[PDB]
Amino acid sequence: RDLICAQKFKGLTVLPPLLTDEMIAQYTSALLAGTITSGWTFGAGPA
């Protein structure tokens, strides 16, 4: 077997994160859109 499955049989597990890669990508896209279309006004108040 691989290394990930060999550790589960010894009690060692890996819990998945709450925010997936898609949500982080959407957050980064929103930040880029706010920085390009508004600049720094979206960090203080309305865009």
Binding site: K8, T13, L15, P16
Partner: protein, 41 residues
């Protein structure tokens, strides 16, 4: 998963590392199983 004892007593069991097919339901005596199953990551 508990919404709080001050609100209700309904709970939700989250078996970690399963596929909704190897659930046990001296053999890990059965608990309150939910009929609304949903497979997550």
């Amino acid at each position: 998963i508990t919404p709080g004892t001050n609100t209700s007593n309904q709970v939700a069991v989250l078996y970690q590392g399963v596929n909704c097919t190897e659930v046990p339901v001296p053999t890990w005596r059965v608990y309150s199983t939910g009929s609304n199953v949903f497979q997550t990551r």
